[PDB]
Amino acid sequence: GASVADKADNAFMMICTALVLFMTIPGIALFYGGLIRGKNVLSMLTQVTVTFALVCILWVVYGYSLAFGEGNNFFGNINWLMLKNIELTAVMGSIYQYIHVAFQGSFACITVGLIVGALAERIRFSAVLIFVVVWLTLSYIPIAHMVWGGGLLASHGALDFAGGTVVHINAAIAGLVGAYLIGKPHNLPMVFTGTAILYIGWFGFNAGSAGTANEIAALAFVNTVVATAAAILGWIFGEWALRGKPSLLGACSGAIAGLVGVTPACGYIGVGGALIIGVVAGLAGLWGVTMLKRPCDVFGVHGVCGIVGCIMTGIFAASSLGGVGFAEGVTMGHQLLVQLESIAITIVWSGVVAFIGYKLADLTVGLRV
Amino acid sequence: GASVADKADNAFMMICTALVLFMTIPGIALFYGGLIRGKNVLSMLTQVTVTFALVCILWVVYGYSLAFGEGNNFFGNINWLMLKNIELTAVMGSIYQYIHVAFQGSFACITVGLIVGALAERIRFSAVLIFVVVWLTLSYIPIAHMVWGGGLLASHGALDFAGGTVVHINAAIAGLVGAYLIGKPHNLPMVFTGTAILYIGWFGFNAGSAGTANEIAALAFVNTVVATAAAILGWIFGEWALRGKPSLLGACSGAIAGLVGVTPACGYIGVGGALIIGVVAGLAGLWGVTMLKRPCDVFGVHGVCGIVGCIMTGIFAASSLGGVGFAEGVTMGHQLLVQLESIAITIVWSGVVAFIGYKLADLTVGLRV
Amino acid sequence: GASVADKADNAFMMICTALVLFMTIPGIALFYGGLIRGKNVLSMLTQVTVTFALVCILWVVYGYSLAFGEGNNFFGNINWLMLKNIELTAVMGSIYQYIHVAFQGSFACITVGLIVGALAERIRFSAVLIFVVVWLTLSYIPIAHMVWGGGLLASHGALDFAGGTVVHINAAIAGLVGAYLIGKPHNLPMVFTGTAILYIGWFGFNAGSAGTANEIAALAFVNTVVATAAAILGWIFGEWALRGKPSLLGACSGAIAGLVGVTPACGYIGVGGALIIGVVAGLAGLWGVTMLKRPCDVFGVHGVCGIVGCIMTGIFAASSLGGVGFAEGVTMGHQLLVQLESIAITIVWSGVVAFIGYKLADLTVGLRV
Ligand SMILES: CCCCCCCC/C=C/CCCCCCCC(=O)OC[C@H](COP(=O)(O)OC[C@@H](COP(=O)(O)OC[C@H](COC(C)=O)OC(=O)CCCCCCC/C=C/CCCCCCCC)OC(=O)CCCC1=C2C(C)=CC(C)=[N+]2[B-](F)(F)n2c(C)cc(C)c21)OC(=O)CCCCCCC/C=C/CCCCCCCC
Ligand SMILES: CCCCCCCC/C=C/CCCCCCCC(=O)OC[C@H](COP(=O)(O)OC[C@@H](COP(=O)(O)OC[C@H](COC(C)=O)OC(=O)CCCCCCC/C=C/CCCCCCCC)OC(=O)CCCC1=C2C(C)=CC(C)=[N+]2[B-](F)(F)n2c(C)cc(C)c21)OC(=O)CCCCCCC/C=C/CCCCCCCC
Ligand SMILES: CCCCCCCC/C=C/CCCCCCCC(=O)OC[C@H](COP(=O)(O)OC[C@@H](COP(=O)(O)OC[C@H](COC(C)=O)OC(=O)CCCCCCC/C=C/CCCCCCCC)OC(=O)CCCC1=C2C(C)=CC(C)=[N+]2[B-](F)(F)n2c(C)cc(C)c21)OC(=O)CCCCCCC/C=C/CCCCCCCC
């Protein structure tokens, strides 16, 4: 008579959650650790660790409730504060809701990790803490609600499997604003290791977004492998033609470009589409960081490849191109408009909230160190 | 007619086992590697690796049989030597017994890893090998039998989900004795990475102790996230008030304090209780290392937070506080006495056996390098 | 009416796949990174990353089809190019075929990683790329087809659970030829970390080769723990007797020796046999690297222990020795001949194809840097 959780899905989603947490601790920390100067590594690792703990607490206190509760088109409710009224045996989809809480919580953590790790070098410890609380509550939570919580964008049929908008575009804009309001790689092997951990954990990230160990999770898994590989080759060959020599940083940057690009598309497109998305994202990323020259720059990779991925998702979702197919009565032209709407709303929403958070921190404690 | 294993539980427990092994190799090794001097790192990594291999062999030869066989209140039997009389399709709980062997074996490995890694710098290679064999056989095995093998403490209704006594208190005392009989951080990023690996693997540690991918595993997972985060914040804010500035080492120490503290409680208490246990363990740990000043010190974190966690487990297990509830006919007052008994017996048992092991090594090969 | 995938097996195999990918990124990269000179680390990491991406693409384009399609005794077909004609819900064994694609793809990646990482220091970037394409297509693919694709060796009843021939012997010969045609450890902690990651990922490697979370996967898991531990002890004690002192490199080398040795045997033999295989492989490996002195040398460990493991697999598979038992009508003498045939064919096949690949690269771009 009651809902039943699937233990295979339980097992899969719990492990995926650990993999996503792995992306932050120590994944994204080691990544930025090798990029920034050695004199700021220790301070950066501290901020990433402390803000990570902050997000975890805020998420269970009110974060999850406002993101996945009901709710309007933008915000949920406050009936799941400290996970109250959530039975231990409550089922969300085919898993226990508690697992759903932890999984989506790890998504919030890595999103914040992307921002903090890239500007911890330049932002006061007190300031970044203030920014996190504001931006998480007023940007990440409602955007996650719009796309995954049955909000505005979800009701328009937006296609974002693992968070092209919710995570990558959302954080890229927030980081770009911060880098603006305040404006050599120390250890490349450390960058490689961070990239490596990010890649491995990204499988929990992408395939876990299926919420079950099924054929869609399988599709997202293979598409993550293919797009990442195609983006590595796409970047380094573009780099080998441009500057006449491949680099380790270029190879790692290419991998991230593909992971970001396939993030909204992995569970919607075919393997052929994944290879195309990979190559394009790899080239678009390489074009992005060079055109930006005319870890502040990685927000160019996350931004561009995120936008590219969301757009190409609206194309290669079509059954004709090997995708899973658009919803009933939806054409490619209509879907692309919805993708563009999702991108536009996310950029505006994040930019405004980020600005407010940074400004608020600047007036209370100041941003400069 | 015969017992059947659950493949979802099989899959989950095998992955959890790998995660616990991950805590030792290379988790705890990288952790102590960044703490101790650089001139002793190579020797320490060797001892940790060799003793790890030693425990693995001893465990399957007689370790598992004496720990989970039957048995009296303190020791099992010797009918499962080299896993003899254990059918390949034998089921322990809802998984194949072979998986149960490997999982509990990884618990023995990390427990020994906690000890060896912290005093490899000061103890002769020949001496630590002698100590491991003695202490594993006469301390870890019977204590594991008392709590998890249906021994003395288990029959009193002791609440220890993932090893507040069996692992943390047991090893802390053993390490404290050793540090007594023989009595600057080299790489903080290495400490952070070790802490990171320990944290990720700890999910297999805590949630895996449920023995199945169910709502209890889900509860332990979320409680591990919450308590760790609350302990990080608890430590650094206590540190920020005390010495006027947060540190990377403090953040990492806080994470370990919460992981240790929630270890016996994760599958018994509520999320609210987990946050409280986290904050308290974080503060108790910070108080511990400073009061100890008036990797020898980490045995203060493991000891104190382990004791604190076991005690607070007897409190927040109550249904009134959001816990899963005490056994039928058990009051909070009675449960706390059982918790205290478990702590007392473990401290005495470990201290005596550790002393004998160290003394025996001192008379045969000598402890000093 | 149609075939159904098992979600527990789906979950298990997807996680195992991630663990095998973990062995390459960053596992094998960090391993060779600490071995070779510091001036070649960055270039080596780049080649490993780029060739990894190359294998991933080649595998889905035609690699999987030619390896597991049908097919003759040596090659499959080309009806699964870009995974065409493979329904998303298609089932291979008890999992979705897409998962089977990714899992076997990760095996191809780590095999190539073993080769590239060991001679990236000495081989031109353009040359190794040419070699990979040739060797993967004409050596790895048909050998994998012979053993796992229902080819020649599989029809003779060859026992190779996780790739004693397909991976280890195959790559060792290819690397040995390369080292011949072109013919101090930088960071031992980096070697240890690489060894650690390889070990953890190896559980997905060995236990995943069961294709399901069953008692055979459980057996392979425990045997991986036991053989690795026994080989660590076997190596260092042989080293402690020979040179009078154990080393970190020796401990790590021992671990790899056991992992390699138990690779073809893990799902076929008993725990007692695993301990024997471990000790023997550990000693055979130590003997190998010293006799080779009268990361070029690791191909001695992979070669010897691979051969030893394949042979001892034909012995300890017997029910009398605790194994799962030979096929109906197969004696130990007959099985050993089949093992020897598998080893002989693999060595010859790989050596010829490797030679052609290296020569072809030498005539087009040249091998020397
Ligand atoms: C070429 C050059 C140009 C390129 C660059 C373009 C630049 C940007 C372009 C953006 C283009 C995107 C356009 C916006 C969204 C349209 C959605 C819509 O209107 O569809 C109606 C229908 C339901 O109807 P309804 O509106 O009644 O319900 C939803 C309504 C109430 O929500 P409620 O739950 O009650 O919450 C109560 C409360 C109050 O809420 C607010 C926000 O005050 O909520 C809070 O708590 C408030 C939140 C509290 C926040 C707390 C702090 C955080 C603050 C952050 C700051 C953010 C800054 C602003 C962000 C921008 C958001 C728009 O919520 C709204 O507000 C709606 C917007 C109003 C409005 C309109 C309208 C009505 C008709 C039209 C034409 N427009 B509009 F002109 F497009 N328009 C614009 C431009 C801006 C607005 C506000 C606006 O939708 C549904 O649910 C689903 C059913 C429909 C079936 C599927 C087919 C659909 C298919 C759509 C395809 C679209 C293709 C476009 C392509 C774009 C190409 C780039
Ligand atoms: C304020 C200041 C003070 C603060 C500091 C306090 C300091 C420390 C306090 C400790 C307080 C903890 C008290 C000890 C445990 C009591 C358990 C008990 O007695 O309960 C009986 C009942 C079953 O009855 P039974 O005793 O017949 O069976 C069990 C019996 C035989 O085992 P067996 O399987 O046959 O093995 C055969 C063989 C021989 O064994 C031994 C050990 O020689 O086993 C070996 O191989 C031997 C092992 C081989 C080892 C090999 C080398 C390794 C060596 C290690 C060295 C270790 C050093 C010593 C360790 C200390 C252990 C106590 O095993 C025993 O020995 C029992 C102990 C005897 C004894 C008693 C008794 C009888 C009654 C009383 C009152 N006491 B006692 F005075 F408390 N007491 C003390 C103080 C010490 C002892 C020995 C002792 O239990 C059951 O099974 C379950 C059924 C009951 C239903 C649930 C409700 C229960 C609820 C209990 C709540 C308690 C609350 C206390 C609060 C504490 C607050 C801090
Ligand atoms: C002490 C000192 C010595 C120590 C050192 C020893 C040194 C090396 C020893 C090696 C010893 C290993 C011996 C080889 C394999 C025997 C298998 C066999 O012959 O069994 C028959 C039966 C089916 O019959 P059939 O042959 O008709 O079918 C298979 C046949 C056709 O395949 P097809 O699908 O049509 O593909 C079409 C096409 C063409 O193919 C080829 C390759 O041109 O495929 C391509 O695309 C071609 C591939 C395209 C490649 C593209 C580029 C890649 C190039 C790589 C270069 C590789 C170099 C060469 C590699 C060596 C391979 C042998 O494929 C063949 O070619 C077969 C080989 C021919 C031959 C024979 C024969 C017939 C009888 C005998 C006795 N021999 B033979 F003398 F042993 N022999 C040798 C020595 C060499 C050859 C070629 C050879 O098998 C089955 O299927 C199963 C049914 C049987 C039931 C289970 C009980 C079995 C039990 C066997 C136990 C054996 C124990 C030996 C112990 C060894 C101890 C060390």
SS3 A91: strand
Distance between CA atoms of B9 and B280, rounded to whole angstroms? 33
Residues in B closer than 8 angstroms to C30, CB to CB, are none
Other residues' Cβ atoms within 10 Å of the Cβ of residue A37: 11
C-alpha distance from residue A349 to each of A130, A338, B235, C300 (Å): 18, 16, 35, 59
CA-based nearest distance B116→chain C, Å: 15
Chains contacting B (3+ CB pairs below 8 angstroms): A, C
Half-sphere exposure of residue C76, counting CA atoms within 13 Å on the CB side? Answer: 23
Q: Scanning the structure block, which residue is given the tokens 């997972």? A: B221
Q: Residue B42 burial (CB < 10 Å; 0-12/13-18/19+)? A: middle
Residue C25: DSSP 8-state: I
Q: What is the Cα B327 distance to its own chain's centre?
A: 24
C-alpha distance from residue A170 to each of A110, A126, A313 (Å): 12, 22, 17
Among A66, A70, A74, which is best to mutate for testing ligand 1, by the most ligand atoms less than 8 A from CB? A74
Among B197, B203, B337, residue whose Cα is nearest residue B263? B203
C-alpha distance from residue C349 to each of C33, C172, C298 (Å): 29, 12, 20
Q: How many helices (H) and strands (E) does chain A have?
A: 15, 2
Beta bridge partners of B91: B96
Residues in A closer than 8 angstroms to C86, CB to CB, are none
Q: Residue A221 and residue C99: Cβ atoms within 8 Å?
A: yes
CA-based nearest distance A104→chain C, Å: 19
Q: Residue A53 and residue B229: Cβ atoms within 8 Å?
A: yes
Beta bridge partners of B203: none
Q: Does residue C189 sit at the B interface (CB-CB below 8 Å)?
A: yes
Distance between CA atoms of A152 and A340, rounded to whole angstroms? 14
CA C150 – ligand 3 centroid, Å:
14
CA torsion C128→C131→C137→C141, rounded to 10°?
Answer: -80
Which ligand 1 atom lies nearest to the CA of residue A73?
Answer: 34
Among B118, B226, B228, B104, residue whose Cα is nearest residue B166? B104
- Residue in C closest to A193 by C-alpha: C26
C-alpha distance from residue C48 to each of A26, A234, B327, C129, C368 (Å): 22, 16, 56, 10, 18
Method by which the model was determined: X-ray
- Residue in A closest to C19 by C-alpha: A200
C-alpha distance from residue B36 to each of B29, B113, B172, C190, C191 (Å): 11, 15, 18, 17, 19
Q: How many CB pairs under 8 A join A and B?
A: 137
- Residue in C closest to B106 by C-alpha: C225
Element (H, E) at A92: strand A91-92
Pair of tokens at residue B53: 């291999």
Q: Scanning the structure block, which residue is given the tokens 């590594």? A: A41
Phi, psi (5° rounding) for residue C291? -75, -20
Q: Which amino acid is at B47?
A: Q
Query: Are A295 and A339 a contacting pair, CB within 8 Å?
Result: no
Peptide bond into A71 cis (omega under 30): yes
Question: For C21, which of A200, A207, A217 is closest by C-beta distance?
Answer: A200
Element (H, E) at B302: helix B298-316
Q: Residue C117 burial (CB < 10 Å; 0-12/13-18/19+)? A: buried
Distance spanning both ends of chain A, measured CA to CA = 59
Query: Are B341 and B153 a contacting pair, CB within 8 Å?
Result: yes
Residues in B closer than 8 angstroms to A5, CB to CB, are 214-215
C-alpha distance from residue B112 to each of B21, B29, C195, C272, C349 (Å): 12, 12, 20, 24, 46
Peptide bond into B26 cis (omega under 30): yes
Q: How many helices (H) and strands (E) does chain B have?
A: 15, 2
Residues sharing a CB contact under 8 Å with residue B56, sequence separation 6 or more, in sequence order:
B105, B109, C225, C226, C228, C229
Task: Give the DSSP letter string of B149-198.
Answer: SS-HHHHTT---SS-IIIIIIHHHHHHHHHHHHT---S-HHHHHHHHHHH
Peptide bond into B288 cis (omega under 30): no
Q: Which amino acid is at A186?
A: H
Q: Which fold has domain B1-369?
A: Ammonium transporter fold (1.10.3430)
Alpha-helix residue ranges (DSSP H) falling in chain C: 7-22, 29-35, 41-58, 64-68, 97-119, 125-135, 141-147, 152-155, 170-181, 188-208, 215-242, 248-262, 271-291, 298-316, 332-364
Beta bridge partners of A28: none
Q: Residue A213 and residue C29: Cβ atoms within 8 Å?
A: no
Phi, psi (5° rounding) for residue C150? 80, 30
Residues sharing a CB contact under 8 Å with residue A336, sequence separation 6 or more, in sequence order:
A311, A314, A315
Q: Parallel, antiparallel, or unpaired for β A95-96 and A91-92?
A: antiparallel
Q: Does residue A105 sit at the B interface (CB-CB below 8 Å)?
A: yes
Distance between CA atoms of C165 and C154, rounded to whole angstroms? 12
Residues in C closer than 8 angstroms to A254, CB to CB, are 53
The CA R_g of chain A, rounded to the nearest whole Å, is 19
Distance between CA atoms of C12 and C208, rounded to whole angstroms? 8
Question: For B246, which of A46, A88, A102 is closest by C-beta distance?
Answer: A46
Distance between CA atoms of A37 and B315, rounded to whole angstroms? 47
Pair of tokens at residue A212: 């079950």
Inter-helix orientation angle B97-119/C215-242, to 10°: 30
Peptide bond into C189 cis (omega under 30): no
CA-based nearest distance B275→chain C, Å: 30
| Residue ID of nearest Cα to ligand 2 atom 12 | B341
CA-based nearest distance C249→chain B, Å: 8
Element (H, E) at A258: helix A248-262
Among B74, B146, B339, which is best to mutate for testing ligand 2, by the most ligand atoms less than 8 A from CB? B74
